[PDB]
Amino acid sequence: SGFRKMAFPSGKVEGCMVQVTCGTTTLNGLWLDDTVYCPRHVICTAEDMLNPNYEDLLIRKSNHSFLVQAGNVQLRVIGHSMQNCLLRLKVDTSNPKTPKYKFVRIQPGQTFSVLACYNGSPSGVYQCAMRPNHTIKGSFLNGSCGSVGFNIDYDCVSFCYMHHMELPTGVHAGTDLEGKFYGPFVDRQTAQAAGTDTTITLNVLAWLYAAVINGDRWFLNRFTTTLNDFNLVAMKYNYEPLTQDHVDILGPLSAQTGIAVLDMCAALKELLQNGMNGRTILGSTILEDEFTPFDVVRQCSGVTFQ
Amino acid sequence: SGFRKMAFPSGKVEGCMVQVTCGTTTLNGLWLDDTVYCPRHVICTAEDMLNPNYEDLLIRKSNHSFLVQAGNVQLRVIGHSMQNCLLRLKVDTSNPKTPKYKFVRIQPGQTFSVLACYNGSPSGVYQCAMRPNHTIKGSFLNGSCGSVGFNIDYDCVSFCYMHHMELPTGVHAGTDLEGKFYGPFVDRQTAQAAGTDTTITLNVLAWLYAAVINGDRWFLNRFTTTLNDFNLVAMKYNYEPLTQDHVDILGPLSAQTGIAVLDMCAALKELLQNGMNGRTILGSTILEDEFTPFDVVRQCSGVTFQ
Numbered sequence A, B: 001s002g003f004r005k006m007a008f009p010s011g012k013v014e015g016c017m018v019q020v021t022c023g024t025t026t027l028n029g030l031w032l033d034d035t036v037y038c039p040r041h042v043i044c045t046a047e048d049m050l051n052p053n054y055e056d057l058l059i060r061k062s063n064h065s066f067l068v069q070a071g072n073v074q075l076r077v078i079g080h081s082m083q084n085c086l087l088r089l090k091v092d093t094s095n096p097k098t099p100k101y102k103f104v105r106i107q108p109g110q111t112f113s114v115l116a117c118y119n120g121s122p123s124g125v126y127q128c129a130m131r132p133n134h135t136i137k138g139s140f141l142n143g144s145c146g147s148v149g150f151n152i153d154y155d156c157v158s159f160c161y162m163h164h165m166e167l168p169t170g171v172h173a174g175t176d177l178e179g180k181f182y183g184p185f186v187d188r189q190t191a192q193a194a195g196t197d198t199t200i201t202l203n204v205l206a207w208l209y210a211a212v213i214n215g216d217r218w219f220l221n222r223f224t225t226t227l228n229d230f231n232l233v234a235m236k237y238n239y240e241p242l243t244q245d246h247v248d249i250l251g252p253l254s255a256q257t258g259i260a261v262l263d264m265c266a267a268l269k270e271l272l273q274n275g276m277n278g279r280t281i282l283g284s285t286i287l288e289d290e291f292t293p294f295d296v297v298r299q300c301s302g303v304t305f306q
């Protein structure tokens, strides 16, 4: 029993973190095989950041412009190239600790583990959802750029995030491991701000199922809803519209609990309209939206506490 | 910016997890140097668990009664001994991945990272507080026993918890790495239940400081309180009495924010009495008590957003 925001074990990622320095700027890099990946803004100074031309800044650098440090060992850079908003630095040594890995672009609403890192040294690990507005509610300070997000499937690490910036609301923006930003953000100084966010309806439903699996049914009701009538309520409460695809995704959880998806939707509608009346669900006084259906199946018992 | 429940990177611990089997019972062990630590209940069957005599059960075992598996490698057991509620199994191989480590008995209110493990294979990591009633609100299923809790200081792992049982309320109980239970619990079947819990006042105060460091002051007020008058309110709301020692511990956070501890106590008193009026603190609608003053200093900027 229990239900916690749970990250993946970080060991396979820790063995990949290095320090990258260009001029007076130091940040984190990701060392896989003989390549080090890092944010291209490592080549910028404070004043470059307003209007940097990365092509022009980079052509002025040699390989020996870059210092890469893995633990106490210096890795010699033997090639470099820009890929979107990242740099790919070729080094003289293949990382002996390279795990089986993939690069994946995660979708909004999906979750991943973040390994916060400073000066090539991992400091902490926590779980994040990719918000509908393409930001994450992370926890990052100066020096954290190049910290990565990932999931682990079997023993394969799926890297999905590299950290680049903080927005005015204190939320975080970054790229996939091909250097493409999540959301409309750019690695320069603009008045850029997070768009309006929405609650991840599919995740809220998954977590209600988690609560039933773990033995709690207080919030259920005798009613059902149509998808469309549910969505009229969702619009009112700034929830994402529910789709048939989301309904299908919830099949396994529905089957394990014996609660039809649209019946669970009716329960959610009532919670939205009436509140929780001083009660909790899985220890929470609010409706949680940062666990996916996958996260629920991963963590909960496969046997419902009936 | 941001503030998350953050675990320590788990890599140094992952390299220590193994599988221990006795008869048909398999659970996790912790392999350090040439010793494997695991819950002594590995030697019990289902029916033993009501009234087990561990001395009598253990004397009936040889070294080859125990199978230890590290990844795909079998470790031969060459000695065994009981220490309180754990077994210490001597093996033929020293763990090459043994980190610098200590065994520590953590105190109530303090936090640690848990590496949930099944069949010797780490599955997830999350942060827990040791509750005043000596339980943790973990997330554990069958097969999770022998999973460990830990903190990391520099590169030294301080192991502080090994998992043994779940109580009727769905919370968790276990031992330190000397095999002594936290709380009055025993590794047998009794009607044992978690005692009444209390909110960790020192942690709530620390987190209010975290909120000010991160830029939010909405909940402060023009008032002060005496320690004793604060404590009359704390009793009413099932909060731990605040002590002068707790006041002293909050010195650094007070200094960084310019808010005297007893002034922060007045703010807390008002929040308890009036509620939060639909507002949030660090994203939370409730008063959070699972971050210590140490956790706040670890994660927050050393510069207050004034």
Ligand SMILES: *[C@@H](CC(=O)OCC)[C@H](C[C@@H]1CCNC1=O)NC(=O)[C@H](Cc1ccccc1)NC(=O)OCc1ccccc1
Pocket (backbone or CB within 6 Å): A027, A041, A049, A140, A141, A142, A143, A144, A145, A146, A164, A165, A166, A167, A172, A186, A187, A188, A189, A190, B001
């Ligand atoms: C990572 C690099 C860094 O530390 O550079 C020196 C400040 C850093 C992460 C950022 C720092 C505080 N919290 C975070 O998540 N990124 C930046 O500082 C980033 C550089 C950049 C990127 C894209 C566009 C423009 C600039 N700048 C940035 O995030 O600006 C907002 C900010 C900066 C510091 C504190 C709060 C907010």
Ligand SMILES: *[C@@H](CC(=O)OCC)[C@H](C[C@@H]1CCNC1=O)NC(=O)[C@H](Cc1ccccc1)NC(=O)OCc1ccccc1
Pocket (backbone or CB within 6 Å): A001, B027, B041, B049, B140, B141, B142, B143, B144, B145, B146, B164, B165, B166, B167, B172, B186, B187, B188, B189, B190
């Ligand atoms: C670890 C060992 C195990 O899996 O044994 C087979 C069930 C397990 C952890 C426990 C399982 C569900 N959630 C957990 O945290 N511990 C036990 O099962 C433990 C053995 C024990 C220890 C001390 C005293 C008596 C028995 N028994 C236990 O926790 O009983 C309560 C329980 C068991 C299963 C599900 C829910 C509650």
